[PDB]
């Protein structure tokens, strides 16, 4: 064995509890809206503090 197995995904489904799903939610990894592996660069303070 050198790769993943369908029963290994079933084991992770049970580990996470994904058998309780009903509808799949949305994500936007193809846009600036959710850069899933970026850094906390957004830290700033408004012009009203100046």
């Amino acid at each position: 064995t050198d790769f993943i197995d369908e029963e290994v995904l079933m084991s992770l489904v049970i580990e996470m509890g994904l058998d309780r799903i009903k509808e799949l939610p949305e994500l936007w990894l193809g846009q600036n809206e959710f850069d899933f592996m970026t850094d906390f660069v957004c830290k700033q303070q408004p012009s009203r503090v100046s």
């Binding site: 993943i4 580990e15 058998d19 799949l24 949305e26 970026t38 906390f40």
Partner: protein
């Protein structure tokens, strides 16, 4: 607040989608193996099975109205290169392999 810009409920959703995406990739062979094996122990993988056939040929990414296509398409590009180290996506998937 609870974490950095890249670590919200959307990352909890990539961990959920990853497992369904990997199951869908396997599950697509079960039906081709005989021609009528439509049955599955996780019916919810059908959403990913349908989306995989789209994202493997799609090119509209930045504006593709199928949010699941642009979403799922980014997961494997991350995972494949990240395998050299521990990560919220790669770590649980590597640990799960011990089951069989």
């Amino acid at each position: 607040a609870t974490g950095p810009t890249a670590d919200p409920e959307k990352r909890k959703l990539i961990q959920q989608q990853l497992v369904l995406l990997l199951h869908a990739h396997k599950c697509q062979r079960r039906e081709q193996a005989n021609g009528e094996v439509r049955a599955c122990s996780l019916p919810h993988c059908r959403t990913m099975k349908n989306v995989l056939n789209h994202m493997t040929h799609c090119q509209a990414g930045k504006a593709c109205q199928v949010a699941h296509c642009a979403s799922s398409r980014q997961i494997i590009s991350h995972w494949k290169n990240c395998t050299r180290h521990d990560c919220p996506v790669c770590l649980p998937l590597k640990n799960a392999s011990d089951k069989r």
